Design a protein around this ligand. Structure first.
Ligand SMILES: Nc1ncnc2c1ncn2[C@@H]1O[C@H](COP(=O)(O)OP(=O)(O)O)[C@@H](O)[C@H]1O
Ligand SMILES: Nc1ncnc2c1ncn2[C@@H]1O[C@H](COP(=O)(O)OP(=O)(O)O)[C@@H](O)[C@H]1O
Ligand SMILES: [Mg+2]
Ligand SMILES: [Mg+2]
Ligand SMILES: [Mg+2]
Ligand SMILES: [Mg+2]
Lengths: 525, 540, 147, 105, 364, 96, 77
């Protein structure tokens, strides 16, 4: 018998369970719903979604990113939760491929539902899918091309990858400008992978084509009252000291005297200590001083009298970015001026962006840190542009780390499906059917990509399959007109890491979901 | 059938005996026994589908909607939201099997359910449940003796780990991490063998750190003969890699000293203020100099430190890590061979730990940094780092690795093994059947019921793999009788042969003994209960 | 336990030496007090308040039996039946204030542990009746009959 | 003999040996931690030298207790009161075993 | 209100398209400052045409690219109709300001408001070599009562804070000083107490407190300062009664509770340099002003004005008056619209006709 | 559910023993005390308020007893014997 | 309720047997005080004040309201 359908009841109130058929039905329904929702936002001709929050603030979000779509949705189906977490982990690993991996997992689970309806034990499906995944991974690895040795070819590959990544997003309107921007921003990192060194500043107003990558750096902080607003040949000192009612860290210390004259003397001594600290800072021979913490009025006027800029309250990210872009050292003690390196830049001034004022660092020495100003017509446009630029930067950083690239436009999926079919044609049993379903899902990915553009997806997929079977391993979808073409010539390329991660994560999630034959829910809180 | 008694006296006066007796319920005798047997049968039938390599998983949802996909029987029953007392007994039996052995948490529940199912028919035939319990106990004694008889020994030596690898692979076969079967088994075996007291003593699990980070691939799970740390270097401009690091483990914050007793330092003049400021500055310089004098390259602190100490450490080419947890401090000290120092005044060269490589590791586009302290000389602590495509498979891999480590620990404690796949169950059932013939008639029924209940594991294994249960089990039993070979089981993987010795399906002997013992004791405890008094209040 | 000031007691430490020596001096003082109490020949100490850990340690060191009676009525009745005087300080008892008894021991009756002050003589200020029974109500009725 | 569950060991406990072939056991009712001397103790100083002396005096009190325990010849230390991490590491450095918050019974 | 951005953001619209249109109006206000209604109506008309375009069977991607092409052509046409303008031509500036104010409630007062706005913009920028206007350098002060005809263009600064030193007002040849410390009893950053164990000490405490306060006041006076502005202090008393009495007895105007955010504006206007410790309080850090007086607005309130400053800064203050609060808010919004129009004329100095001419030419 | 099981029906009271006898005798005594003062040539009259709104101002014991309503059945028996005495001989209703 | 699936209560064994004896004993105890020359009559009130003073056993059980079927057997007896 079963726990639910037993004369005696074994559960508390509100706790139930779903047996084999019911659990499989619910899991497949949830997975197919997630896949259908996330799809239609896939490929060059994919539309965006409106995420209207039901909360008190009612946040409005217009996005094309699949991970963000799946993140901000109330999900109660546990398999849908599995797919959502897959998408989030895929986003964490690499910037792109969230929609691709989610759709692939959904199609795999649809094929699994069909196979189960065809009276096939799920373990056979899992074994066949493991074999097919091995074959597809081997084929994709054998298909990778590396161009990191050649500088110009690697730069061209970076431009192609950035364009391919930005083709689906809202930035496809100015794809060329945004691709150049993203490639330059990534190349300025000099091999470092910290995207936190790249700051994206969203300023409302202006066309989306008004966005630009600043040649130096931009800071959104202020300057002291009596300090210069513009210096030339700056010698910058970046610090992390207090300089705000700075107390000696002996917490048990106190002033205990028997006259107010002594209190005044101690106050004067405190001010003298602050003045001595400011003098020690000035002994470094600096023009601009940047502190992570607050700067109070007395050190402010002390800097002003010396004609030294004092930018205050630049947070940890701010001081890290300034150190990266100028080459200075974040110092907290000033007893050894010769052990501290000072950042240098040609010009510091205040610029007027929108209705706000920012500090502009021009002619920086190192420059291994970028700021990108995004101009848009709506807040939603700015947010979506930032998300798209983040995706492009993530993919470009991954390509810089690992230079292996594969061709997009469904070419990789078609090659994987061809390899899987070749493997399945020489295997007895129903595992051959399982691998055929694997290939069907792999082919369904470019089928959905073509459907989103309104083309004859069936005919295009048949042509691509025939071309790949014949031997044309670089054939792919051409969305300029709606035909098939050479992805190498047309310059649609993707990072090998992204495609491999998509394939492996989709296979893993399909395998873990398929193994489930019973869903047991506790009483909700 | 409930509500206890209700008479209200034969004189018509009120008859109140037990507080709130009109809202309580009770069951007596055979009805209670049948209800217990039904509940246990339901639990066992639910659990039996998750048995063997072809066993399927259960998706468990807690109160907050969090989802765990698992095949571990103990976890499934622990997260399952039961109300029946016998179901709680089954859950506790599975937890007991997990605690003592670590594996076989699903077999015990199925065995107990089968035993109670046979006891149902025995009771229907008109046998006192105490007689059934005694027969079950003595049949279990016979089965345990047979298990000891048919056991085989293995080498737990470090030079040859192949039997250990096979045992770990057999343990991990039913889990989802079988896609990296041999790799996971080998890392588990190496982990257990590394952190173990050689002379058959205990394997201490606080020396094994299991960490799971999302991203990467499940194949990227690796064994680190050191410590993985969630922290990173304190100063952002500190170097990201130290070679031949001479660690300096400290539990003192790099701050001016502070007495624990309530205290007040009086400042009465300007000279006092100057002396206090000089004292603070000189304390910072002195602690940095004391750290540097030992020749250390890396400093590890537990309680964090402030800006002046951070910049002094950066300026003196001394990478440092702050806010390291106490267990992590202990693990680092054990692995690197250093000593935990409570203050800088006691820091010497001989208390410094040595690590071949200290590195900071990125995880893609996440900003999350973690620290690796590996390449130790004779590291007595080990760490397992698990990757995956989602957190759920990460948790499942964590519990599968725990199962493998527990199995290897059991092998270290006792090196005798028996061959699984239902071969041990079939041999025990045959031994019980031969013993029943010599026994007087009355206990024969109990012994035969015990044997038939033992035969459920091969039936479940065959049914889960798609084969016909009764035909396969009967054929295997006939083959075992025909040729003396207690290694013939259920070919779940369809490898062609039934000999589990050749197929390397290996289980710990003590695991099977504990399975049978715990199942028998719980079945007896349930069979001895003939009365329930629930509150029956339907409270909220 | 060592007595404390009634208004407010704070340990004002001004040097390291006083901080180091304070606990040692306090423990030495308590040990001296307990040894002075024991030097009078006393071997049973009955107190009406809590017992300090150090006091219990030093009493155990000198083989002294401790009884802690919370209720003042029991303390008064024990003083009547033994002949001792309830001293208000930890000073060693003078000869007249020291109580005497034929035997004091820890015993178990049924499942309850009791402390018995027993006189061998057929006399004394207070005599007790130990009532046994199979029910609390029965013993209460027997107590009413005794009254 | 006597057996009881392990009672919340602190950091540094895992370096203590877990087997002794003729140990001497120091049964104690002592809190071996850095703490205030008394709940009503107040320290009043007016010099940094006195501040350092007070800190060193607290450390010396704790280390004097630990050194007396070590020189008693015992190898296993049990206390009803908690035993801090400093004492645990001190005993680990001497190849000794410690356990705090042991139940009174 | 008549401002399109204000109307849109003041009412909750609850629809994603409407909220995006509100954001569009906000962005137009940020970049331009006027035309916030025209842009929204243009977007609505474009989508209304998109309705029939989609119904005709056109994918909503050909429409977007065709709209981009039309936008580029329209930008070319608008640039073709544009006429070069330089900031030296005051007539064009006045005409632009009047056109901006034509659609507001202050259309009748335009003859006073538009020259005021043009002068305010030109005061805070250099007419040559300027690329943007920081409107935060123009401070708008709203005082209830009177007539919009009573709006003023004071070239100094207006402080809403009252004068604590009652009895001394309208000091001429002011030597203003801005201090950021407190004129009260001594207090150190670390906690401090004074212990008294003798009556002589207990009297000496008050005697030395008085001496310290008197020394502070005398050192302030010795620099020649006669107007004192005190920054607002929360932890410690900014101005004690004894300090106020000493300052009053030495003929010094005292104004306390100056906000921390207004320090930059005050220093840019007067020219004072803030002082945080009495050691650095010298004569060179004082701002010289011709007059610093407090004026009453016909019983509707009191304002402090400092008119006439040696080396005046690039800041101006506009005082807005009105019968009730609503017309005052609308007058402030309209003046802001005029200032934004002049700012947009400062950068990309090109001019076009209005009255629907450029847009009907665009249509043709 | 599980409605309680009873031998006799609900709301079925039962008294027994000395209490019943004492209650019956006390009810009879109270009934007697009601009209004790209406006997003899010096008897005082009583005013009775009918539920129908009428007023019965009388000295006869039988009328007084029949114009009141009682719940104790012993009082009912007393009223019945008063009516019997009135019907049989015509007077002596207070005396009986 | 359980595997029987009957919309009603059930009692088996000594539970029902005691109830039947208790119900039968209740009827007897009603009329045990009205036996023999030293017996005493009973007073019955019919919920509307109708009084029935009787000593006959049948009359007492006729007017009583009995619910238990075992009691009804004795009352009809
Ligand atoms: N210009 C293009 N031509 C053909 N296919 C493209 C082009 N740009 C992107 N694609 C395809 O669209 C798919 C989805 O990319 P996108 O929607 O940008 O992100 P995600 O991979 O997260 O869905 C990719 O697999 C890629 O092959
Ligand atoms: N390769 C195999 N071939 C046949 N039987 C196996 C194999 N691996 C495991 N089994 C059987 O599957 C049963 C269930 O094991 P498992 O699910 O790993 O843990 P549990 O015993 O807790 O369910 C074991 O009793 C074992 O005999
Ligand atoms: Mg993409
Ligand atoms: Mg197992
Ligand atoms: Mg306008
Ligand atoms: Mg008469």
């Amino acid at each position: 018998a079963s726990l639910s359908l037993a004369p005696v009841n074994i559960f508390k109130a509100g706790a139930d369970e779903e047996r084999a058929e019911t659990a499989r039905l619910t899991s497949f329904i949830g997975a197919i719903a997630i896949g259908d929702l996330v799809k239609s936002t896939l490929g060059p001709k994919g539309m965006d979604k409106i995420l209207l929050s039901s909360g008190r603030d009612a946040s409005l979000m217009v996005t094309n990113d699949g991970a963000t779509i799946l993140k901000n949705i109330g999900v109660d189906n546990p398999a849908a939760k599995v797919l959502v977490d897959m998408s989030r982990v895929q986003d964490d690993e690499v910037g792109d491929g969230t929609t691709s991996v989610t759709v692939l997992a959904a199609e795999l689970l649809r094929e699994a539902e069909s196979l189960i309806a065809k009276k096939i034990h799920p373990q056979t499906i899992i074994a066949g899918w493991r074999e097919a995944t091995k074959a597809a991974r081997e084929a994709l690895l054998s298909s990778a091309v590396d161009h990191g040795s050649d500088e110009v070819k690697f730069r061209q590959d970076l431009m192609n990858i950035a364009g391919t990544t930005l083709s689906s997003k809202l930035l496809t309107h100015h794809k060329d400008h945004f691709t150049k921007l993203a490639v330059e921003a990534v190349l300025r990192l000099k091999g470092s992978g910290n995207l936190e060194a790249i700051h994206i500043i969203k300023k409302l107003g202006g066309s989306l084509a008004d966005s630009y990558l600043d040649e130096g750096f931009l800071l959104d902080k202020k300057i002291g009252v009596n300090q210069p607003k513009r210096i030339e040949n700056a010698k910058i000192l970046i610090a992390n000291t207090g300089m705000d009612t700075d107390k000696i860290k002996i917490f048990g210390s106190r002033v205990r005297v028997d006259s107010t004259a002594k209190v005044a003397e101690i106050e004067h001594a405190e001010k003298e200590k602050m003045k001595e600290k400011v003098e020690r800072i000035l002994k470094h021979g600096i023009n601009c001083f940047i502190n992570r913490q607050l700067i109070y009025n007395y050190p402010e006027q002390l800097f002003g009298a010396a004609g030294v800029m004092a930018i205050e309250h630049a947070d940890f990210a701010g001081v890290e970015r300034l150190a990266l872009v100028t080459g200075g050292e974040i110092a907290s003690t000033f007893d050894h001026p010769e052990l501290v390196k000072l950042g240098s830049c040609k010009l510091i001034e205040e610029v007027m962006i929108g209705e706000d004022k920012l500090i502009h660092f021009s002619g920086v020495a190192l420059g291994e840190a970028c700021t990108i100003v995004l101009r848009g017509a709506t807040q939603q446009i700015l947010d979506e542009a930032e998300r798209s630029l983040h995706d492009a930067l993530c993919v470009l950083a991954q390509t810089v780390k690992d230079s292996r690239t594969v061709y997009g436009g469904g070419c990789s999926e078609m090659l994987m499906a061809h390899a899987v079919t070749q493997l399945a044609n020489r295997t007895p049993g129903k595992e051959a059917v399982a691998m055929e379903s694997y290939a069907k899902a792999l082919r369904m990915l470019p089928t959905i990509i073509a459907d989103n553009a309104g083309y004859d997806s069936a005919d295009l997929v048949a042509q691509l399959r025939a071309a790949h079977s014949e031997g044309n391993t670089t054939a792919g979808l051409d969305m300029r007109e709606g035909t098939i073409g050479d992805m190498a010539i047309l310059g649609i390329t993707e990072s090998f890491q992204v495609k491999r991660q998509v394939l492996l994560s989709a296979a893993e999630a399909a395998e873990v979901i398929l193994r489930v034959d019973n869903i047991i829910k506790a009483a909700p809180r | 059938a409930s509500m206890g008694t209700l008479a209200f006296d034969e004189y018509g006066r009120p008859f109140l005996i037990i507080k709130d007796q009109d809202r309580k319920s009770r069951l007596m005798g055979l009805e209670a026994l049948k209800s217990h047997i039904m509940a246990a049968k339901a639990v066992a039938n639910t659990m039996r589908t998750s048995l063997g390599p072809n066993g399927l998983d259960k998706m468990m949802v807690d109160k907050d909607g969090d989802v765990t996909v698992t095949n571990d029987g103990a976890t499934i029953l622990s997260m399952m939201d039961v109300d029946h007392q016998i179901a709680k007994l089954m859950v506790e039996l599975s937890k007991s099997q997990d605690d003592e052995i670590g594996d076989g948490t699903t077999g015990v529940v199925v065995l107990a359910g089968a035993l109670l199912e046979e006891a149902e028919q025995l009771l229907d035939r008109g046998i006192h449940p105490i007689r059934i319990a005694d027969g079950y106990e003595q049949a279990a004694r016979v089965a345990i003796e047979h298990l000891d008889k048919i056991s085989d020994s293995v080498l737990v030596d470090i030079k040859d780990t192949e039997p250990l690898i096979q045992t770990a692979k057999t343990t991990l076969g039913s889990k989802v991490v079988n896609s990296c079967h041999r790799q996971m088994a080998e890392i588990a075996v190496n982990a257990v063998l590394t952190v173990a007291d050689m002379e058959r003593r205990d394997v201490d699990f606080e020396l094994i750190k299991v960490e799971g980070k999302v991203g990467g691939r499940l194949e990227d799970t690796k064994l680190i003969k050191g410590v993985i740390v969630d922290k990173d270097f304190s100063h952002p401009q500190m170097p990201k890699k130290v070679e031949d690091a001479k660690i300096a483990i400290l539990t003192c914050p790099f701050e001016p000293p502070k007495p624990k007793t309530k205290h007040k330092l009086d400042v009465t003049s300007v000279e006092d203020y100057k002396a206090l400021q000089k004292y603070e500055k000189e304390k910072f310089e002195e602690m940095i100099q004391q750290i540097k004098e030992t020749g250390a390259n890396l400093a590890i602190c537990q309680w964090g430190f402030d800006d002046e100490a951070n910049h002094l450490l950066l300026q003196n080419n001394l990478p440092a890590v702050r806010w390291v947890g106490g267990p992590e401090i202990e693990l680092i000290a054990i692995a690197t061979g250093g000593r935990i120092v409570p203050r800088f005044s006691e820091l010497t060269a001989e208390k410094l730990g040595f690590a071949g490589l200290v590195q900071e590791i990125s995880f893609g586009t996440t900003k999350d940094k973690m620290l690796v302290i590996e390449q130790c000389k004779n590291s007595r602590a080990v760490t397992i780092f698990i990757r995956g495509g989602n957190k759920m498979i990460i948790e499942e891999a964590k519990r599968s690795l725990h199962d493998a480590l527990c199995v290897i620990r059991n092998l270290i404690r006792d090196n005798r093994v028996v061959y699984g796949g239902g071969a041990a169950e079939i041999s025990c059932a045959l031994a019980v059947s031969q013993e029943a013939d010599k026994c007087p008639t009355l206990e024969q029924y109990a012994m035969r019921a015990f044997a038939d209940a033992l035969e459920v594991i091969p039936m479940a294994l065959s049914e889960n793999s798609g084969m016909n249960p009764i035909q396969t089990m009967t054929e295997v039993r006939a083959r075992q009788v025909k040729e003396m070979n207690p290694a013939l089981g259920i070919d779940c993987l369809h490898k062609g042969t039934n000999d589990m010795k050749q197929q390397h399906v290996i289980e710990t002997l003590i695991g099977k003994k504990q399975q049978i013992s715990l199942a028998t004791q719980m079945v007896r405890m349930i069979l001895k209960i003939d009365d329930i008094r629930k509150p029956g209040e339907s409270e909220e | 336990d060592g007595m404390i000031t009634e208004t407010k007691g704070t340990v004002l430490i001004k040097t390291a030496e006083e901080l180091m020596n304070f606990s040692k001096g306090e423990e030495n003082l308590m040990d001296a007090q307990v040894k002075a109490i024991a030097d009078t020949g006393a071997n049973v100490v009955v107190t009406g308040g809590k017992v300090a850990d150090m006091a219990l340690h030093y009493a155990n060191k000198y083989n002294i039996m401790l009884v802690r009676l919370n209720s003042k009525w029991d303390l008064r009745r024990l003083c009547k039946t033994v002949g001792a005087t309830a001293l208000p300080r930890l000073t060693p008892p003078v000869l007249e204030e020291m109580g005497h008894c034929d035997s004091v021991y820890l015993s178990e009756v049924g499942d309850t542990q009791v402390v018995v002050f027993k006189h061998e003589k057929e006399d004394g200020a207070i005599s007790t009746i130990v009532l046994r029974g199979s029910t609390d109500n029965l013993m209460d009725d027997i107590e009413r009959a005794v009254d | 003999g006597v057996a009881f569950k392990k009672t919340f060991s602190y950091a540094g406990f895992e370096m203590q040996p877990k087997k002794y072939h003729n140990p001497k056991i120091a049964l104690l009712n002592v809190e071996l931690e850095l703490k205030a001397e008394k709940d009503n103790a107040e320290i009043r100083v007016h010099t940094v030298e006195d501040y350092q002396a007070i800190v060193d005096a607290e450390w010396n009190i704790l280390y004097d207790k630990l050194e007396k325990i070590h020189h008693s010849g015992a190898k296993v230390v049990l206390s009803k009161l908690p035993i801090g991490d400093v004492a645990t590491q001190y005993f680990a450095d001497r190849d000794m075993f410690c356990a705090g918050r042991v139940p009174e019974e | 209100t008549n401002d399109g951005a204000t109307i849109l953001k003041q009412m909750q619209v609850l629809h994603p398209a409407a909220r995006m249109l509100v954001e569009l109006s906000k962005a137009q206000d940020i970049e331009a400052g006027d035309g916030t209604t025209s842009v929204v109506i243009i977007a609505g008309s474009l989508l209304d045409s998109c309705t029939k375009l989609l119904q005709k069977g056109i994918h909503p991607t050909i429409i977007s690219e065709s709209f981009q092409k039309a936008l580029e052509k329209g930008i070319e046409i608008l640039t073709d109709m544009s006429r070069p303008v330089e900031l030296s031509d005051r007539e064009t500036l006045l005409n632009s300001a009047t056109t901006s104010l034509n659609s507001k409630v202050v259309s009748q007062y335009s003859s006073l408001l538009s020259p005021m706005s043009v002068n305010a913009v030109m005061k805070v920028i250099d007419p040559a070599t300027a690329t943007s206007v920081d409107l935060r350098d123009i401070k708008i002060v709203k005082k209830l009562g009177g007539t919009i005809d009573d709006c003023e263009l004071v070239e100094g600064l207006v402080l809403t804070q009252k004068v604590s030193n009652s009895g001394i007002t309208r000091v001429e040849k002011a030597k203003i000083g801005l201090i950021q410390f407190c004129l009260s009893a001594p207090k150190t950053d670390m906690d401090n107490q004074i212990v008294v164990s003798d009556y002589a000490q207990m009297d000496r405490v008050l005697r030395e407190e008085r001496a310290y306060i008197l020394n502070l006041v005398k050192q302030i006076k010795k620099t020649g300062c006669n107007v004192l502005l005190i920054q607002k202090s929360i932890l410690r008393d900014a101005l004690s009664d004894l300090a106020l009495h000493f300052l009053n007895k030495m003929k010094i105007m005292v104004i306390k509770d100056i906000e921390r955010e207004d320090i930059e504006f005050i220093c840019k206007t007067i020219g004072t340099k803030p002082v945080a410790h009495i050691d650095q309080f010298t004569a060179d850090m004082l701002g010289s002003a011709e007059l610093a007086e407090e004026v009453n607005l016909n019983g509707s309130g009191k304002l402090l004005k400092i008119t006439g400053c040696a080396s005046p800064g690039k800041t101006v203050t506009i005082v807005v008056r009105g019968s009730n609060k609503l017309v005052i808010e609308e007058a402030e919004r309209s003046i802001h619209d005029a200032l934004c129009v002049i700012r947009c004329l400062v950068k990309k100095r090109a001019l076009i006709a209005g009255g629907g001419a450029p847009e009907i030419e665009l249509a043709l | 559910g599980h409605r309680p099981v009873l031998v006799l029906s609900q709301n079925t009271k039962r008294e027994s023993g000395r209490k019943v006898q004492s209650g019956n005798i006390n009810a009879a005594k109270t009934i007697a005390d009601i009209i004790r003062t209406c006997l003899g040539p010096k008897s005082m009259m009583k005013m009775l308020l009918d539920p129908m709104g009428g007023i019965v101002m009388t000295n006869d014991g039988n009328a007084i007893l029949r114009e009141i309503q009682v719940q104790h059945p012993a009082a009912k028996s007393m009223i019945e014997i008063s009516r019997t005495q009135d019907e049989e001989v015509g007077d002596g209703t207070t005396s009986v | 309720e359980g595997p029987l699936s009957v919309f009603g209560d059930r009692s088996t064994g000594e539970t029902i047997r005691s109830q039947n004896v208790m119900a039968a004993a209740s009827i007897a105890n009603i009329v045990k005080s009205s036996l023999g020359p030293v017996g005493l009559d009973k007073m019955l009130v019919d919920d509307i004040g109708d009084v029935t003073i009787t000593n006959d056993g049948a009359t007492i059980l006729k007017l009583l309201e009995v619910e238990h079927p075992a009691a009804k057997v004795l009352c009809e007896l």
